[PDB]
RNA sequence: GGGUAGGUGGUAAGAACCUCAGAUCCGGAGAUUUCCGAAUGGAGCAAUCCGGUAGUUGGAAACAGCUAUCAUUAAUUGAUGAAUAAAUAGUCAAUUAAAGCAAUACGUGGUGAAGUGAAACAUCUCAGUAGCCACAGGAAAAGAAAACGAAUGUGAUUCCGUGUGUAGUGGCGAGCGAAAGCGGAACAGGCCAAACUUAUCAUUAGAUAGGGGUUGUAGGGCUUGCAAUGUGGACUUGAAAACGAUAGAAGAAGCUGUUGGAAAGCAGCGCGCAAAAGGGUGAUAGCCCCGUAUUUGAAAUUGUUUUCAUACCUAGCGAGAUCCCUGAGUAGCUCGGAAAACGUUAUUUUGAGUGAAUCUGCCCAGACCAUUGGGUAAGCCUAAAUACUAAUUAGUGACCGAUAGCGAAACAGUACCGUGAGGGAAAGGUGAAAAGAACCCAGAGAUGGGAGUGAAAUAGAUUCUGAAACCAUAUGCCUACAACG
RNA sequence: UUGUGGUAGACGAGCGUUGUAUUGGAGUUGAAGUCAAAGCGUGAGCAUUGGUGGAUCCAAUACAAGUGAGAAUGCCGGCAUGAGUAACGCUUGGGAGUGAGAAUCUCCCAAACCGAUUGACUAAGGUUUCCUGGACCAGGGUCGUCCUUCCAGGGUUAGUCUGGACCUAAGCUGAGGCUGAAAAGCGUAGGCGAUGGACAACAGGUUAAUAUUCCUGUACUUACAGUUAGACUGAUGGAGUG
RNA sequence: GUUAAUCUAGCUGUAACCAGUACCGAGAACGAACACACGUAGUCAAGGAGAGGAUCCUAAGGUUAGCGAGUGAACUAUAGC
RNA sequence: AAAUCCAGGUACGGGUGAAGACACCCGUUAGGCGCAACGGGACGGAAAGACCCCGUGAAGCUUUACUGUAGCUUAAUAUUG
């Protein structure tokens, strides 16, 4: 699954409304990056996490 | 109960036979038939005088305790104090 | 428990028995419940094959009987344990949940066409329709205002009518089409986070379990007093009662005559009614029967409601003051898109980026600013009205009546076609009752002709009626030199 | 008095059907439906009598509709015509018997094709078609006493054969895991998967039908204990062979 | 493993499970809508002449090609000339 | 058995005719009914003409026809010092 693991925010499906307004179905994929994390039992883990939650992790100092 | 039980006397109210008093032998309650001995003897041609069933509507019980051995209806409502359900004639009081 | 006197399911007579010490039958509750199948010991060509483990029995032992257990995954608990010393991954064990099916229906959510319309066509419509997929549920979803929106105003949601085919929106074409307001069905609003306080965690807590507190004419906490013992339910356990659902019991009243095969008709004289709804009975029955109206009744299981007690939750008016709290990668802003009636626009959502404030606040009243006015997001929960009926029961029809009506009145999704998905038919009626036509003649026999039963055998098993096309026979008339819709 | 041909097409008045409602009424002394007849109407249509048939039905006024058939290379069923025409899809002669009936069946004797086959053994398939007795609705391109059809009864017998209980190939599945809006896809360990590898039985006889299976005669194998003697065995792993 | 397990050779005794096994294997049982001239893996494969499984005739064995009987015109096919 | 078939008691010449006649007009010829044959005709039968044209019809294919797009490549921004 190309959704992240902390939350489950998945792709968003929309239209590729070009000039002259021809419609074409298209997908938006979340930005996934392999940044680490540290749990409160040790067990440092590597999880595919999206960037929006990466910022939240960065400010709550969960690394 | 049942208005007609095996054994009791019974007569015919309608049909080719009138006042054909006789005894009942078998009753098929599912299909509403009776087999009265001495009545409706059809000459079977087997490749014999076996009887022919008579529908329970035609049959009617036979009073035998009244001087006029006439024909009448039946009550069940009489449950005698020292007895179970019994048959008693409406236009009389004669058990069975 | 009911309930009587027969019964051993239909094509079904006979044979052999059970039964009126109360069987069969009907209703409630139970037990048994081979094998496959989510299939789950391991396999597998579905309904078969091959086992392990622990007991017990037999056996000298392989081995065979007879029992129970043996899948995976997630959570929790315990044990064990790596590269590496500790630790985690992993492995083993124990306990508790589901995995599937279907009511072709209804609900939500994801994804999502085309035919067609535009008299072509791409924007658009068909359409967020069908289909695929996940997920439940007895209903779901939604929901208690950062609202409507123009006012001395309404005061959660949902659903019906109207507003109206309006304001608007649309290659301003085809087309699309609200939100207010109003009349109605139904009506309930509750609870956390955080301030503060308590106990404990090498208390580095920034964590665990308590108290407390729930918001807008702003509220709550912090300091201090008064009044309270009570309604209230979105709700736990018991007891009692009522009304039902699941078998059933009683349940009035008629004879005579004629046609007649049989009268229940027709006719004469009666009769009963909280019953003249219906079905059968040799032809059309109020009184022959079975019921119906009515009156009734449950050991056992189950439903709705009510009452009494029973927990948990829940209660009110004031005084002090720069005290503290009032949901952060959040609301916004930008780039691409969409829900909303709106083809992107206030409002609402978001894949990418950036990013605030804290009651003198924040958002809102179709770009926007000021004034005025309304409401307090960024946390959760919620019965009712609403949608649907494959199912159980009672019943209805100016609905069909065997080329109809469900594809299917019968052993129909059968036979049959196809490798397979899948496609997919036709046909019923003797008579009131077999009294299913013993016997005789012909014939090998089916069968036929007499007989016989019966009202009728032109009702005969080819079985209600029995047209037409069609094929044969026959009285009567015409036709073999004649060109003929 | 003036008119009355007529498709497309406008307008008017009407017949019939099925059922519901109320009102009258006929019916086993024979209802509807069905045929037949030398009737009545301006038309759609409507009576009368008789045979058959064996229980429902007719008229008056409104009402409601699955409401009116000669055509759709219409659908379903039946029936003709073409026609007793083409066809009948590789082969004979007779004796005796049976039987009501024989070219067609049973037996016999020839005759004619096959013979790297129309013969004999089996795999794949098919699923009782096999054997005995009986029958002649239907099927058999004729007939039939007969059929591979139908009916009643019957037959398939393994330590060694084909396959499991042993093995693996292509490949299939696939715990954890990887990837993917969803379903699913990929794939490791394990597990399956013969067309192949490894494993011990020969000859003859018998029944209507079975046969390395049953029987007779002679054999081998793989396990299990108990026993005598000898010897220290030596795998879930390494190697050789296969 | 020795205070004997396990194997080897022999003797006595015991056991050897599950499905298939008929018949057809095609000018009539299979796939061709059929009792249709077509198709379908492998095996055995006699004698004379012959290089031979070719070719002609026969054997072991097996079949009567499930409509006949005539006539011997046109005409058609097939052979012969 | 079959395809066919508006009912049929289904002549020929000249002419006419929706323009080439079994039926019409005017002449001509011909007893009723089969059987074997052969094919001139009945614009014979089988096929809603394949050619052609028409439809604001379909599909396949092409391209420097239009509009878009899977891919490939380039820059800003996040991942990120
Ligand atoms: Mg404004
Ligand atoms: Mg002919
Ligand atoms: Mg001929
Ligand atoms: Mg011929
Ligand atoms: Mg062949
Ligand atoms: Mg072969
Ligand atoms: Mg040879
Ligand atoms: Mg040869
Ligand atoms: Mg033609």
**Straight-line distance from CA A39 to C1' C397, in Å?**
73
- The residues spanned by each domain of chain A are 1-63
Which residue has 């489950």 as its token pair?
A8
Q: Which nucleotide is nearest to A59 (CA to C1')?
A: C329
∠ CA B9-B14-B89, rounded to 5°: 45
Location of structure tokens 């960037």: A51
Q: Is A60 left (phi over 0), alpha (psi -120 to 50) or beta?
A: alpha
- With a 7 Å cutoff on the CB, does A36 touch strand D? no
Length A7 CA → C380 C1' (Å):
19
Question: Can you give the resolution of this entry in Å?
Answer: 3.4
Beta bridge partners of A42: A39, A40
How far from B51 is each of B19, B33, B39, CA to CA, in Å?
Answer: 17, 12, 7
CB within 7 A of strand C (chain A, 44-63)? 50-52, 55-56, 58-61
In contact, B4 and B27? CB cutoff 8 Å: yes
CA end-to-end span of chain B: 12
Task: Delimit the domains of chain B by residue range.
Answer: 1-96
The Cα B27–Cα B1 span in angstroms is 14
């Amino acid at each position: 699954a190309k959704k992240d693991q902390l939350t489950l925010r998945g792709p968003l499906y929309g239209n590729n409304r070009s000039h002259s307004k021809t419609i074409t179905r298209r997908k938006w994929n979340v930005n996934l990056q392999p940044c680490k994390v540290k749990t409160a039992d040790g067990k440092t883990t590597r999880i595919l996490v999206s960037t929006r939650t990466l910022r939240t992790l960065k400010k709550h100092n969960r690394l | 109960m049942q208005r007609i039980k095996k054994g009791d006397k019974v007569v015919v109210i309608t049909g080719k036979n009138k006042g054909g008093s006789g005894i009942v032998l078998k009753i098929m309650p599912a299909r509403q038939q009776a087999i009265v001995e001495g009545l409706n003897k059809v000459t079977r041609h087997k490749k014999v005088q076996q009887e022919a069933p008579i529908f329970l509507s035609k049959l009617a019980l036979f009073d035998q305790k009244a001087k006029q051995q006439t024909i009448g209806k039946i009550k069940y409502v009489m449950d005698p104090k020292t007895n179970k359900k019994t048959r008693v004639f409406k236009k009389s009081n004669n058990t069975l």
